[PDB]
Ligand binder design. Structure first.
Ligand SMILES: *[C@@H]1O[C@H](CO)[C@@H](O[C@@H]2O[C@H](CO)[C@@H](O[C@@H]3O[C@H](CO)[C@@H](O)[C@H](O[C@@H]4O[C@H](CO)[C@@H](O)[C@H](O)[C@@H]4O)[C@@H]3O)[C@H](O)[C@H]2NC(C)=O)[C@H](O)[C@H]1NC(C)=O
Ligand SMILES: CCCCCCCCO[C@@H]1O[C@H](CO)[C@@H](O)[C@H](O)[C@H]1O
Ligand SMILES: *C(=O)CCCCCCCCCCCCCCC
Ligand SMILES: CC(C)=CCC[C@@H](C)CCO
Lengths: 11, 325
């Protein structure tokens, strides 16, 4: 989910 | 304790014959002039801090292509919302506060209240929609679904619909806009039981639809997200990066939730008191206590949601330092 986390700007 | 009239309600008793229409004469009897000066000063603060931070967001979005992704549209929306809060509300209240009363009359009251309420609701519903998008994208709750441009556009339009469904009724007969507190800014009527426009049902519909529903949606979506991230990081303790990610995501969710509560809880609680122990003695300064927290959300919402976003940050340090970094 690290990719998804960067997509939504949370990581 | 108050003093009513056709299109207002001055929270000050006319036993001494001094109360005047907030559209026509200065209200220096419900507050010293220096308190109107401090009202204007705080509006100055909210403009000087709120306009650069929010305009710059749209600017760097125009400069950096890596920012023009759909999962960013709602953020842009937020910025626009805050600008509606700045030029539709903060500047007007600066000018009128410098006269001591609302100089633009009842129609100007409908405009300033319509655009202030609009902007604030666009901001709130942008926060909700953002929470939903992150729940969907990160938690993967639907089989074979990725988030496209049309979904983002739909979300923005949903914020606009929820906003109009909350700022337009007072212009047409469900509740009404009247000068609040020190009578220099205009807002939704929830301190008079004005039956001709059915204020009670509108205040209930506010608290239920435009406060409880967003609160539950945000808490649900972000709780689900922290659960998902915690669980994955549990199944991946060999990845220190996943551990970092779990920590930072949890801290951010706590910051965003607490900021939401700090922003909209005083308005809901104080307004609900002025609509549960309604009619009593309410200092105008007492009336401007939740509006402080809610209005300042044009400044710290871009700080939390944009300045603490590594992409936007990077592009802003790049733009402000006109080249590098
Ligand atoms: C808060 O309380 C204030 C005082 O009770 C109140 O202000 C009064 O408002 C009335 C008007 O509704 C003012 O009445 C005028 O008084 C002058 C003399 O002092 C009269 O000459 C004048 O004559 C009127 O003119 C008409 C048109 O030709 C004519 O039909 C009659 O002559 C008619 O009487 C008015 O009578 C009164 O002076 C005001 N008081 C003060 C102290 O200024 C505020 O309205 C009230 N606030 C709110 C928000 O309601
Ligand atoms: C509605 C979303 C709010 C969720 C925030 C709850 C965060 C709880 O806190 C978390 O619990 C851990 C224990 O597993 C603690 O070690 C940490 O403080 C933190 O990671
Ligand atoms: C291009 O390289 C530009 C470099 C950045 C210049 C340094 C900015 C100085 C800080 C000014 C901010 C304070 C303003 C005063 C507040 C009222
Ligand atoms: C005016 C009232 C009694 C409740 C309104 C709750 C607000 C905090 C909702 C803002 O969108």
């Amino acid at each position: 989910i690290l990719e998804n986390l960067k997509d939504v700007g949370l990581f | 304790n108050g003093t009513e009239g056709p299109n207002f309600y001055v929270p000050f008793s006319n036993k001494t014959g001094v109360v005047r229409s907030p559209f026509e004469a200065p209200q220096y009897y419900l507050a010293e002039p220096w308190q109107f000066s401090m009202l204007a000063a705080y509006m100055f603060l909210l403009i000087m801090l709120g306009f650069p931070i929010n305009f710059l967001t749209l600017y760097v979005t125009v400069q950096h292509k890596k920012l023009r992704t759909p999962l960013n549209y709602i953020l842009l929306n937020l910025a626009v919302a805050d600008l509606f809060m700045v030029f539709g509300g903060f500047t007007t209240t600066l000018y009128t506060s410098l006269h001591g009363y609302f100089v633009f009359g009842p129609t100007g009251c409908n405009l300033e209240g319509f655009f202030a309420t609009l902007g604030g609701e666009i901001a709130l519903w942008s926060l909700v929609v953002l929470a939903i998008e992150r729940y969907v994208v990160v938690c993967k709750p639907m089989s074979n679904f990725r988030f496209g441009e049309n979904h983002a556009i739909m979300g923005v339009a949903f914020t606009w619909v929820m906003a109009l469904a909350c700022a337009a009724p007072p212009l047409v007969g469900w509740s009404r806009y009247i000068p609040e507190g020190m009578q220099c800014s205009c807002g939704i009527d929830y301190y008079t039981p004005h039956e001709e426009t059915n204020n009670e049902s509108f205040v209930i519909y506010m608290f239920v639809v435009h406060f409880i529903i967003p609160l539950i949606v945000i808490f649900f979506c972000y709780g689900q997200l922290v659960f998902t991230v915690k669980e994955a990081a549990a199944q991946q303790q060999e990845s220190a990066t996943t551990q970092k990610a779990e920590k930072e995501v949890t801290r951010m969710v706590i910051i965003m939730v607490i900021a939401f509560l700090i922003c909209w809880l005083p308005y809901a609680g104080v307004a609900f008191y002025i609509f549960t122990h309604q009619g009593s003695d309410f200092g105008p300064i007492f009336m401007t206590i939740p509006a402080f927290f809610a209005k300042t959300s044009a400044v710290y919402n871009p700080v939390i949601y944009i300045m603490m976003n590594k992409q936007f940050r990077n592009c802003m340090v790049t733009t402000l330092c006109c080249g590098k970094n």
